[PDB]
Amino acid sequence: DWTSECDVLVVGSGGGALTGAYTAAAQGLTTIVLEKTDRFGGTSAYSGASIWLPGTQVQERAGLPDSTENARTYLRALLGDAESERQDAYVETAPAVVALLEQNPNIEFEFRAFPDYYKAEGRMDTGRSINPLDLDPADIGDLAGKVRPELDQDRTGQDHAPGPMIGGRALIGRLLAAVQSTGKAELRTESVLTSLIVEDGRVVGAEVESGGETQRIKANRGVLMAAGGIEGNAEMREQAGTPGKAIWSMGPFGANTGDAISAGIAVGGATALLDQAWFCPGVEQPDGSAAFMVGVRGGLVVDSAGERYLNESLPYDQFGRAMDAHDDNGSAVPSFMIFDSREGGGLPAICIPNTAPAKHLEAGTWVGADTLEELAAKTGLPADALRSTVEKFNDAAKLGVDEEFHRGEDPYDAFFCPPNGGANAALTAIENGPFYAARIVLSDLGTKGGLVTDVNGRVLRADGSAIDGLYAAGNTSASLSGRFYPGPGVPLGTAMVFSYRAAQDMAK
């Protein structure tokens, strides 16, 4: 009846999953990791691998003036008392996770400056998040070729480009090497959770599609589901009311289709926040997909009425939420990013992946013109309003103050701007034609709604009771952060901590 057996079964292979697998296997529990696709890492592999794990040994090594209490204060100020026990667990457990992981020879992190996202008590203007060190692929043997490549390769039919592995690729490559090095773990690809197996009300294993045949895998201590969210499932998204679209999502196409969330619902798990995501603006691509637009450093953005309606330097989640809030039947989705030839026709932001302007212009996702009047005609924006919007923005750039949306009055805004700008580095006149308009959509970096869990990642029913044997973390679980993206690395940070805590709970 059972095909194989282990102490801890982990579904998924993102940062959280592999951290949970490591925590279990490092303390002697046999572990099996199941990855649906032919590559480990999921969206985590795509990530910059910034991780919000504050007040740990890593920041101490950088002399950073911060602490557990300062971080706790920051979360409380943003989130309120909703999920305060989970906020506490997140912050307090960070040091221990980092310490455990850094004990492994394959893992080292460092602090990297990148500001927290909201003005509030406890904010770090330079940030407090950490990153895995760049990784020479030869140092993890055959595992490197099993890591999912960066977006600029993975959506163009390519594997890893010739540099070292960095960001998400370093994170996942290092985590895989550490998991393997325990000698207690089995890492499987093309292995898909189908449903959970319950005996006497306790989750005791799972049914799994692999090699076209069904398997039943027994989990003596428990099952950690960290298999992403619903971002790739248009139906579940429509049903929940999630904004954006599956095709605009920056998750790997077809990977995160809400399987683990559904499997948990099927055994009694409650859910929450299904209409929420980790939002971001996306540059629409020729093929209908999107690219993560981050680090805006010029231009402005208008609705279909040719009017500005938000601070374009806002952090990506807040930018996205502002698009959705303003949207009336497609009036803000798409929005149009307007810019001049200051950067040779480049869009003044970082786009991931980074499709050449020529390709966008061929396809009509972007449009160019010698005057704002033509640009309006070609995009359907009112000519007079566009013209007017730009003149007004340019006036604001000259004075160095944006009275309307207060762009450039925040360290996040300033962090990305190049030198020799002007009075305000975030406000630069749009005036040296040709002029361009790029379509911007409501992308995501994964959804953040899912199964309700407690401080140790146990999945809960509607009455708050724990489903024995079942755990969830990362975007399979409803995030403690609610409607907020507090700073860089929260999605990976929360995924990693609660995967660790769930593995610790299974070890008791």
Ligand X SMILES: C[C@]12C=CC(=O)C=C1CC[C@@H]1[C@@H]2CC[C@]2(C)C(=O)CC[C@@H]12
Long-range contacts of 134-142 (CB under 8 A, 24+ apart): 134/164, 134/165, 134/166, 134/170, 135/164, 135/165, 135/166, 135/169, 135/170, 135/173, 135/174, 136/164, 136/165, 137/164, 137/165, 137/173, 139/106, 139/177, 140/106, 140/173, 140/174, 140/176, 140/177
**How far is 56 from 113, CA to CA, in rounded Å?**
15
Judged by CB under 8 A, the chain residues 24 through 43 that form the site for a copy of itself are 38
Q: Is 31 in the site for ligand X (CB under 6 A)?
A: no
**Cα dihedral sign for 292, 154, 345, 421?**
positive
160 binds Na ion (CB under 5 A): no
CB atoms within 10 A of CB 38: 9
488 binds, among Na ion, ligand X, a copy of itself, none (CB under 5 to 8 A by kind): ligand X
Given 16, 20, 42, 48, the residue binding ligand X (CB under 6 A) = 48
Residue 106 annotated as binding? no
- The residue from 34, 53, 58, 502 that contacts a copy of itself (CB under 8 A) is 58
Q: Considering the complex, what minimum distance in angstroms separates the CB of residue 14 from ligand X?
A: 13
35 marked ligand binding residue: yes
Whole-angstrom distance, CA of residue 158 vs CA of residue 286? 18
By CB under 5 A, tell whether 149 contacts Na ion. no
Binding residue (CB under 6 A) for ligand X from 294, 369, 385, 401: 294
- Tell me the residue type at 424: N
Is 329 known as a binding-site position?
no
Residue 166 binds a copy of itself (CB under 8 A): yes
Among 3, 4, 5, 68, binds a copy of itself (CB under 8 A): 68
Stretch that binds ligand X, among 169-177, 217-225, 238-246, 488-496 (CB under 6 A): 488-496
Q: Which stretch binds a copy of itself (CB under 8 A): 119-127, 237-245, 269-277, 478-486?
A: 119-127
457 contributes a contact to ligand X by CB under 6 A: no
Q: Is there binding between residue 153 and Na ion (CB under 5 A)?
A: yes
CB of residue 449 vs ligand X: minimum separation in angstroms? 18
- Binding letters toward Na ion, positions 352-371, x by CB under 5 A: --------------------
**Binding flag, residue 488, ligand X (CB under 6 A):** yes
Binding residue for a copy of itself (CB under 8 A) from 22, 111, 118, 484?
111
Total residues in contact with a copy of itself, by rule CB under 8 A: 84
DSSP state string for 213-251: EEEEEEEEEEEEE----STT-HHHHHHHT--S-GGGB-S
Bridge partners, residue 47, by sequence? none
| Residue 181's binding partner out of Na ion, ligand X, a copy of itself, none, with CB under 5 to 8 Å set by partner kind | a copy of itself
Per rule CB under 6 A, is residue 486 in the interface with ligand X? no
Q: How far is the CB of 332 from a copy of itself (least distance, A)?
A: 27
Q: How far apart are CA 339 and CA 354, in angstroms?
A: 17
Contact between 102 and a copy of itself per CB under 8 A: yes
Annotated binding residue at 481? Answer: no
Nearer Cβ to a copy of itself, position 356 or 462?
356
Q: Which two tokens stand for residue 300?
A: 């402005």
420 binds a copy of itself (CB under 8 A): yes
Q: From CA 383, how far away is CA 339, in angstroms rounded?
A: 15
Strand partners, 309: none
- 43 has binding-site annotation: yes
According to the binding rule CB under 6 A, does residue 489 interact with ligand X? yes
End-to-end CA distance of the chain: 27
The least distance separating ligand X from the CB of residue 150, rounded to whole angstroms, comes to: 9
Residue 349 Cβ vs a copy of itself, minimum distance, rounded to whole Å: 12
Phi and psi at 435, nearest 5°, equal -110, 150
Per the CB < 8 A criterion, the answer to whether 162 and 145 are in contact is: no
350 binds ligand X (CB under 6 A): yes
Site for ligand X in 216-255 (CB under 6 A): none
Half-sphere exposure of 178 (CA within 13 A, CB side): 26
Q: Which partner from the list a copy of itself, ligand X, Na ion, none does 489 bind, CB cut-off 5 to 8 Å by kind?
A: ligand X
Q: How far apart are CA 435 and CA 394, in angstroms?
A: 14
Q: Do 252 and 154 contact (CB within 8 A), yes or no?
A: yes
259 is in an annotated binding site: yes
Which residues ranging from 129 to 148 are in contact with a copy of itself (CB under 8 A)?
136, 138-142, 145-146
Q: Which stretch binds a copy of itself (CB under 8 A): 111-119, 206-214, 430-438, 479-487?
A: 111-119
Rg (CA), the chain: 23
CB atoms within 10 A of CB 43: 29
- What six digits make up the tokens of 458? 């146990």
CA 186 to CA 224: how far, in whole Å?
A: 15
At 296 the three-state DSSP class reads: coil
CB of 52 to ligand X, least distance (A): 7
Residue with smaller CB distance to Na ion, 346 or 482: 346
Q: CB under 5 to 8 A by kind: which of a copy of itself, Na ion, ligand X, none does 50 bind?
A: ligand X
Q: How many Å apart are CA 174 and CA 139, to the nearest integer?
A: 9
- 379 known member of a binding site: no
126 binds a copy of itself (CB under 8 A): yes
What are the binding residues for FAD?
35, 43-44, 48-50, 193, 256, 259, 445, 475, 492
**Residue numbers of the site for ligand X (CB under 6 A)?**
48, 50, 114, 162, 294, 350, 488-489, 491
